[PDB]
Amino acid sequence: FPNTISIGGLFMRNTVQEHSAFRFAVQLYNTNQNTTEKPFHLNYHVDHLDSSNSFSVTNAFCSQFSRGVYAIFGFYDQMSMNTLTSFCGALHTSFVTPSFPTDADVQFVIQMRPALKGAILSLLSYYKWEKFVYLYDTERGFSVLQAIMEAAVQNNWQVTAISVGNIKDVQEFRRIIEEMDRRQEKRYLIDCEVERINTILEQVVILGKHSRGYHYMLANLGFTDILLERVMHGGANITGFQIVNNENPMVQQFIQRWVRLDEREFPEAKNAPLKYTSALTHDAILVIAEAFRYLRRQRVDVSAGDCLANPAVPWSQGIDIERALKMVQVQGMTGNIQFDTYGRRTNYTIDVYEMKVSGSRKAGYWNEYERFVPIVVTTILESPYVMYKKNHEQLEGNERYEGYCVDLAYEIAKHVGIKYKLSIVGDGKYGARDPETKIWNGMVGELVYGRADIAVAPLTITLVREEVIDFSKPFGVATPKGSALGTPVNLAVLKLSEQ
Amino acid sequence: FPNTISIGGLFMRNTVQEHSAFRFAVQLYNTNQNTTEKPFHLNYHVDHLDSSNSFSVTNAFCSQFSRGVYAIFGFYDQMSMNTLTSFCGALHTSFVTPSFPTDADVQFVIQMRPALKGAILSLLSYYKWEKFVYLYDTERGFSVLQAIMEAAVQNNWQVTAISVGNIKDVQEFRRIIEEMDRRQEKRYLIDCEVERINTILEQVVILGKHSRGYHYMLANLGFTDILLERVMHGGANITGFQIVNNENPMVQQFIQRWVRLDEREFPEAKNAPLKYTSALTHDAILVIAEAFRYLRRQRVDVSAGDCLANPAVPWSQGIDIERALKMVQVQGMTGNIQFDTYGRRTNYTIDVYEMKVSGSRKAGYWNEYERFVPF
């Protein structure tokens, strides 16, 4: 058994802190005094990628492989995911990565980041969400998207998915929020990188739509690194996830010894919050060190060329190494550590945080077995149907309207048992179709496109409209297609007529 | 100047007609009699690859480079364009391909597929489209998606973009069509591969949404391969684009000699319609041959190392090779062939077809300077 173990390192851009944790964690292992806990020295070879062109990524990997390493620890993103994953599998070299888990199962890579699809789905059922907006990108895989859309069919939800992956101008973000606001959408499910989430919820506050009613779910680990001071002032609910618990004694010891380090040797150490990826980076050394300690106990023999060789014959000890790495069980900084056959984390735990005006609070945990143990009415102005009261300037609310229709709306609401907020269509027309643009206008246009629920007004009944919206019997009021207020209002007017 | 010129091939799966067309075009050039038009012999080292991996793709490319080639002609999909494009640009080896044009500006890549951004935008403004449903997938870059979104903000459109690139169960397609119809959406703009377009148009006819009133604009240069006979009879409106014109004397001559070929040595000949990608493959051999003849006439020095080397030393003469290939002006099947500084074609002649009950009808043509001119 070699007296020293060499492992590779591949760090992409904007990962300076993770580099410090990688260096710090290795130092802690080396400085240990007990012979049993430190049976061999540990070395490492760092390298920086570009993640833009596969020539740089391929060259960097071959430099590491040719030099001679046992395992490789590094990050990858969408562009360079395929190059590193494919090379590692063919050459029989493990790859301990804290990056997002791969969508398709693959061998010889162990991804130590818990998935969220299970946690998200349970919370959606817990809050009983039926319709909402879903903003997403493709910087972390399609796994979450393919589960939300698949679950919508089985539960008959009304998800409205939007892809904001390629948006580069804040105008698109503003229009998306405004357009979905017109449809009375109060629930959003933001699943994007940290930078995008900051931009998205910076637009909501400028638009001033962080009031009491709206609820936001931030499906992204790293709930600490999201600016939330401004949004929470309005009172809008917010929900996030975390895996690093500050009350665990292990994190407290690491954090206590992590802030006293010299700045020059370990940049961005003391005056910066600790990203969860730093916690995963520290854990990786525990997993790799533990795996090699086991390999030493069993007296398993272990001991390079160039990547592109025909035929590509891999060194036979690779299978043993990954088996050891996929069997360890260590109580790490992020909780229990256990890997299944394909290398994904299992028996993990996510802590959900429901943060309020006073501050963040822990609202429960999501174990893998115990899952999450804790009307606007449109109308047009036409006397005597709807008219302004004697003094509409002083009055506020729907108390400034007086006429025939407002009386009818009150009677219908009382029968059904709802609350109505009278609104005036700004177009000023009953409704018609433009022959060239095929765009409805007026009351029917608003009613069809989901901007209203019922429409009490002198809306003449005709064949053209009846094909688009469901009227009631003549008195007729209108409702969207498939709305649940169709039958109750139809009977309400019929019984009113009989009296 | 060498007595013979050797190039390479890189064909992925679902590519048989193009492979036979690539062989036929080379044979056509080699068998010519006029010594002025056939100064040098041409050869190829065709090789197949699997894009699903990135270890076999680079392994196949490095074998081509080590063998020694002057230019490489091959295809690439979304998940393997980075490896091919990046290696070529770093080792100074041109790459003539008929596949989809790249989103970014990259050198040492010559693309023979005309873009569709201009044609779609002009048609949308000509038909007064201000409320449509944009179904799309990302198998051919995001170039079209950005153009539509940027145009919508400027022109104040209302686009409901839905990504259908990751749908395997047809029930999802049914829900999308049913819901969008509930909002009174009559105009669609389907931008997907040929296989997916067939699936979508299959669900439309089953649902009975193919009657008069609905307008479908198939944004793909494959109008001669979409199975839409059923929708034709329904009465809906269909619009499509094409680049290959059957009245061109060159097209007619090639097809006359195309169907007479052997059915075993040249598979997919005399059996299936000539996919437009086969036309681009024939034009690629026109461009490669013409560019190298020009170099021989001008008395330029052209005349292999390891695939990967820490000192990246490119060819000294590879700038000349890819400079000549971008000056060509050779009339071919797809109209005028002429490249700009980035390897993207210029002076297109995109052709618009509108289909009626009688049959497909020439509705007009779109040009970069004259935009859309109907007749």
Residue numbers in the entry:
A (entry chain C): 2 to 304, 309 to 379, 397 to 497, 737 to 760
B (entry chain B): 2 to 304, 309 to 380
Task: Quote the original article.
GluA3, a subtype strongly associated with disease, functions as both a fast-transmitting Ca2+-permeable AMPAR at sensory synapses, and as a Ca2+-impermeable receptor at cortical synapses. Here we present cryo-electron microscopy structures of the Ca2+-permeable GluA3 homomer, which substantially diverges from other AMPARs. The GluA3 extracellular domain tiers (N-terminal domain (NTD) and ligand-binding domain (LBD)) are closely coupled throughout gating states, creating interfaces that impact signalling and contain human disease-associated mutations. Central to this architecture is a stacking interaction between two arginine residues (Arg163) in the NTD dimer interface, trapping a unique NTD dimer conformation that enables close contacts with the LBD.
